[PDB]
């Protein structure tokens, strides 16, 4: 039968003067007599006729090859392929063969004049809530004094390290955790293989957690200070590594002096109405203020303000500008609830201020790194280009816990398949361009989610799995504190134990598989700059193919019993060197030989 | 068998003061325990507990049903079904049951409030080409003077209607229609049933097709005048009848006062460079300016230009502005090529632009309709609020090009049978929410494409099928001068024929067809106002039903050999007397006699 394959990298995608080269590969009977590339000259579908190449790839398969003229237009170059015979018309895409034109996010793509953070192509990210990772030895006296949480009422519980996370007092609780903890620690993730930290609010505020923020401009004490944050910026910069804070723009702490709650001090837009900052926090008739889903702790942020925007984005001295120039030069933000930020308490104009935003960055550090916190389809923050990258919450993690844990975001059941999967994912996918796709943010759980492999329940051996399918598929990967140690948990407040750093408690078996993908994903340009074609996916085997150049790199996930398989014969499996990486599997001309609940990995 | 159905209108979406509450149908064995309804308050994406209704709205029929609090949230709230079992999960959109959780625009989708134009739906309209519909008798003094078109180098070419389009002097050839021979043919119309004018290209220009403005603020004195578009102006608005204006925006004419690319001008950003217009357009080094499609006569426009800005769309006499203003009162405007706006000669910011003429039009028209020439996927515009309605030619006239015609956009070469075609359709509608799917500018060929007839070939047969489909389907319709009396044509030189008045020369059994229709349309509250769900998808035959309320609508068409169809069972179809109103298939208890070539439709 007739097969097509592009998949949006060098083997095809070649830069040849303002001339970029898009190539397909066919490969059956009836062929088509005509090939057509449908690309967006400047916003207008057009078409441009594909040639014939004398000279065959690999045997047997014929290449055709055309140009998108780059000299002119925008820098997304969206295209696909259209095959003609003389009565029929079939559509070859990312997501495959088609009979219907598919639609402009449906279709391969390439930044060509890629202006945003290249660095983060080939990174691994750790993931750390700082009281709850590592406590500092000499402690100033300011981080173990008791303070109360207006915002609870009761007083912080300090506790001591092997103290269990209990149900009471969730937010309030501390362990210690600081940024000393973690320039600590800058050796233990280096030998690990870390590249880069993602570090949750460190400003000053009330919580545990610190995203009911009180200032903007200095770090909390109990987290530690300036001082705690100038040395891991600093100790890092000399390790390779690279730092992301945690902003919340979608609301500030009851407790901030801009949206005083408790008359703890003065100025509030609470309880006096001609404050400054009156029209930068939404009230009703009745007069309570404007508060995320209901939690009083939390007060929304109107950015109808001309001044509002000013202190967040747009003057020389705003809070997302500030911790990005000197003498800080933070490697970028994490966006808290990106898609609630907007005025009059709601989202009104939410496309405007985050756009906004990403642009003051990229005047400050052209080559910042900006975050989605979407749950839920995200497809247009980016769609649009306000982000740089979207934590993949939709196309990578909930994914997984379809597949491997019978889960969704809600946790309720949830009974997919291999290509169910597979489809789901190369959907979302198909619809950001090359170089979106390798800038996601995937991981498998969260400060947001119970412990991953707490969720497996009965299925606990699929773990690896999921850690081995973490490293292949497209994007930045993370690694939340705790997992890589085989930690577990529910939900909050018991997702956030406190890290064991004594031996008799890591399961080492799983810290090895981290270093292992963690250094092959750095071995391979594939594993990190490379396409990715789903090869095979029924039934509870899945299988795919990471390309660049000349590297291939071929995985393999059951979550079954044992089994063999017929990879339908493919261009990508008739690499020269079937050397094993991974895994325990073999691949026996083209039949597969997987060992139970297994995750493979081949590679040259 | 478990099935369910649900369409966004009333019965089951239905507002209750401070709160829209949605209803689900559900037929089959294997009940689910539970159901939950997503809905989306500020991009959050939620849970609303659906109860099972005690008074079960049909035989055969459980309902289930939930509430969606309006005093907060955002306009056009999307929402969808996620079905609970105890192991398993379904969820249902307005393409149907799936495994994958949905995608955000595929939901399901309604607008409470509405802001846009309401009025829109309701209208039908007729889509008029100046030079070529009605010659008013008592001709002017200039408006039969002979110029040169130096944009051709040649003279333009003078012409009565009866003489036969030639393809040579495409923008040269001048038959001699102006704005009173349309004010004077308005009985024609009210006769036919129209109740709106699209009026294309009509501000001056040395051409025929008048994309090449070159005096935005006067009314050409060969397609009638200022005075001219004050008469037709006052007809229409005493007549009843609603006239929109095209907004030719990208460029301007490169005869125009602001480029004068001929030396017959004045400050002309072409030979003189310090001209306070050359920020308006982009040039390139060689003199060149960045010119529409590399036709000299368009010269793009760079809209990075506050002064252009103003002058287009922000500033209070604006170009916009104007004509939905006393003293012109347009109804609104059609932005031919409004995707290509932005700045550098290109797309930059073309959301920013188109979003902002479109937000000029309402501000002074507040009730304005603003439709935007999109030959492809306008989909991501759509979902910005950027544009009210658009051209729907890939959501609509394509879909159908494809299945009736056997046709593409640029290559005739295409295969289509009933399922392939209905998907696409309900695809771009599930993009789009409903009091937008009702605003879709529905037509079947234009002064851009060929003629349909034509494009039929030798299956002329189905021309009354589509016809029906026209004014049945979703959305308005904009009925192109001539296709009613059967006019032909093939090209943008040869599909704007002039109107033929001679009654020996009008195929009169196509324009009795409008009429009912029309009619029809407009009696029902359905064709207008209502839901529609597609119930029957194969080969030649699609069988469709609008739904409201109470009121229902029958369609079904056949392409092909007569047959016999098997109706799946529906709870719309309980309807108490489906008196034909137009076809010969007859309906037999869920059995349909399809005859071949037929376009039966029934209503109750």
């Given at each position: 039968?007739?097969?097509?394959?592009?998949?949006?990298?060098?083997?095809?995608?070649?830069?040849?003067?303002?001339?970029?080269?898009?190539?397909?590969?066919?490969?059956?009977?009836d062929?088509?007599?005509?090939?057509?590339?449908?690309?967006?000259?400047?916003?207008?579908?057009?078409?441009?006729?594909?040639?014939?190449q004398?000279?065959?790839?690999?045997?047997?398969?014929?290449?055709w090859?055309?140009?998108?003229?780059?000299?002119?237009?925008?820098?997304?170059?969206?295209?696909?392929?259209?095959?003609?015979?003389?009565?029929?018309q079939?559509?070859?895409?990312?997501?495959?063969?088609?009979?219907?034109?598919?639609?402009?996010?449906?279709?391969?793509?390439?930044d060509?004049?890629?202006?945003?953070?290249?660095?983060?192509?080939?990174?691994?990210?750790?993931?750390?809530?700082?009281?709850?990772?590592?406590?500092?030895?000499?402690?100033?006296?300011?981080?173990d004094?008791?303070?109360?949480?207006?915002?609870?009422?009761?007083?912080?519980?300090?506790?001591?390290?092997?103290?269990?996370?209990?149900?009471?007092?969730?937010?309030?609780?501390f362990?210690?955790?600081?940024?000393?903890?973690?320039s600590?620690?800058?050796?233990?993730?280096?030998?690990?293989?870390?590249?880069?930290?993602?570090?949750?609010?460190?400003?000053?505020?009330?919580?545990?957690?610190?995203?009911?923020?009180?200032?903007?401009?200095?770090?909390?004490?109990?987290?530690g200070?300036?001082?705690?944050?100038?040395?891991?910026?600093?100790?890092?910069?000399?390790?390779?590594?690279?730092?992301?804070?945690?902003?919340?723009?979608?609301?500030?702490?009851?407790?901030?002096?801009?949206?005083?709650?408790?008359?703890?001090?003065?100025?509030?837009?609470?309880?006096?109405?001609?404050?400054p900052?009156?029209?930068?926090?939404?009230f009703?008739?009745?007069?309570?203020?404007?508060?995320?889903?209901?939690?009083?702790?939390?007060?929304?942020?109107?950015?109808?303000?001309?001044?509002?925007?000013?202190?967040?984005?747009?003057?020389?001295?705003s809070?997302?500008?500030?911790?990005?120039?000197?003498?800080?030069?933070?490697?970028?933000?994490?966006?808290?609830?990106?898609?609630?930020?907007?005025?009059?308490?709601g989202?009104?104009?939410?496309?405007?201020?985050?756009?906004?935003?990403?642009?003051?960055?990229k005047?400050?550090?052209?080559?910042?790194?900006?975050?989605?916190?979407?749950?839920?389809?995200?497809?247009?923050?980016?769609?649009?280009?306000?982000?740089?990258?979207?934590?993949?919450?939709?196309?990578?993690?909930?994914?997984?816990?379809?597949?491997?844990?019978?889960?969704?975001?809600?946790?309720?059941?949830?009974?997919?398949?291999?290509?169910?999967?597979?489809?789901?994912?190369?959907?979302?996918?198909?619809?950001?361009?090359?170089?979106?796709?390798?800038?996601?943010?995937?991981?498998?759980?969260?400060?947001?989610?119970?412990?991953?492999?707490?969720?497996?329940?009965?299925?606990?051996?699929?773990?690896?799995l999921?850690?081995?399918?973490?490293?292949?598929?497209?994007?930045?990967p993370?690694?939340?504190?705790?997992d890589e140690?085989?930690?577990?948990?529910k939900?909050?407040?018991?997702?956030?134990?406190?890290?064991?750093?004594?031996?008799?408690?890591?399961?080492?078996?799983?810290?090895?598989?981290?270093?292992?993908?963690?250094?092959?994903?750095?071995?391979?340009?594939?594993?990190?700059?490379?396409?990715?074609?789903?090869?095979?996916?029924?039934?509870?085997?899945?299988?795919?193919?990471?390309?660049?150049?000349?590297?291939?790199?071929?995985?393999?996930?059951?979550?079954?019993?044992?089994?063999?398989?017929?990879?339908?014969?493919?261009?990508?499996?008739?690499?020269?060197?079937?050397?094993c990486?991974?895994?325990?599997?073999?691949?026996?001309?083209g039949?597969?030989?997987?060992?139970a609940?297994?995750?493979?990995?081949?590679?040259?």
């Open positions: 039968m007739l097969n097509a394959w592009h998949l949006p990298v060098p083997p095809f995608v070649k830069q040849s003067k303002d001339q970029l080269l898009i190539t397909l590969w066919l490969t059956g009977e062929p088509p007599q005509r090939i057509m590339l449908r690309t967006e000259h400047d916003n207008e579908e057009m078409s441009v006729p594909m040639h014939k004398r000279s065959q790839p690999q045997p047997g398969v014929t290449a090859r055309a140009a998108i003229d780059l000299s002119s237009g925008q820098p997304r170059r969206r295209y696909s392929f259209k095959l003609l015979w003389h009565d029929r079939r559509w070859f895409t990312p997501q495959g063969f088609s009979r219907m034109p598919p639609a402009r996010l449906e279709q391969f793509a390439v060509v004049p890629d202006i945003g953070p290249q660095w983060a192509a080939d990174q691994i990210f750790y993931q750390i809530f700082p009281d709850r990772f590592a406590r500092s030895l000499p402690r100033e006296a300011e981080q004094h008791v303070y109360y949480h207006h915002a609870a009422g009761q007083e912080i519980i300090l506790r001591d390290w092997d103290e269990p996370v209990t149900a009471q007092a969730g937010g309030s609780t362990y210690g955790g600081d940024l000393d903890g973690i600590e620690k800058l050796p233990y993730l280096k030998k690990l293989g870390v590249t880069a930290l993602y570090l949750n609010p460190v400003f000053k505020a009330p919580s545990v957690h610190k995203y009911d923020t009180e200032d903007y401009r200095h770090v909390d004490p109990q987290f200070g300036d001082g705690a944050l100038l040395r891991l910026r600093h100790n890092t910069q000399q390790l390779g590594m690279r730092l992301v804070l945690d902003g919340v723009f979608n609301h500030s702490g009851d407790s901030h002096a801009w949206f005083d709650r408790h008359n703890r001090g003065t100025g509030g837009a609470c309880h006096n109405p001609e404050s900052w009156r029209d930068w926090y939404s009703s008739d009745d007069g309570t203020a404007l508060d995320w889903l209901g939690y009083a702790s939390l007060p929304k942020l109107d950015y109808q303000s001309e001044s509002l925007v000013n202190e967040i984005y747009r003057g020389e001295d809070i997302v500008r500030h911790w990005l120039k000197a003498p800080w030069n933070m490697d970028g933000w994490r966006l808290d609830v990106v898609h609630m930020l907007g005025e009059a308490g989202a009104r104009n939410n496309m405007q201020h985050v756009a906004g935003i990403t642009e003051a960055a005047e400050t550090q052209p080559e910042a790194y900006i975050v989605g916190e979407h749950f839920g389809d995200a497809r247009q923050w980016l769609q649009a280009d306000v982000e740089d990258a979207a934590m993949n919450y939709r196309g990578f993690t909930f994914p997984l816990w379809g597949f491997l844990a019978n889960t969704d975001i809600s946790y309720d059941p949830q009974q997919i398949d291999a290509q169910t999967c597979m489809a789901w994912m190369d959907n979302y996918r198909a619809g950001l361009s090359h170089q979106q796709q390798l800038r996601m943010f995937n991981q498998l759980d969260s400060h947001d989610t119970a412990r991953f492999k707490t969720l497996l329940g009965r299925d606990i051996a699929r773990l690896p999921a850690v081995v399918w973490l490293f292949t598929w497209p994007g930045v993370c690694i939340y504190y705790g140690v085989g930690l577990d948990g939900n909050d407040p018991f997702c956030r134990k406190p890290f064991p750093w004594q031996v008799e408690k890591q399961d080492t078996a799983l810290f090895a598989l981290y270093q292992r993908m963690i250094a092959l994903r750095k071995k391979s340009q594939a594993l990190r700059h490379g396409g990715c074609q789903v090869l095979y996916a029924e039934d509870n085997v899945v299988v795919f193919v990471r390309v660049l150049n000349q590297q291939r790199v071929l995985v393999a996930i059951n979550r079954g019993e044992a089994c063999e398989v017929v990879l339908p014969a493919s261009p990508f499996l008739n690499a020269v060197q079937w050397q990486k991974e895994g325990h599997g073999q691949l026996t001309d039949i597969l030989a997987l060992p609940i297994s995750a493979t990995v081949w590679m040259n």
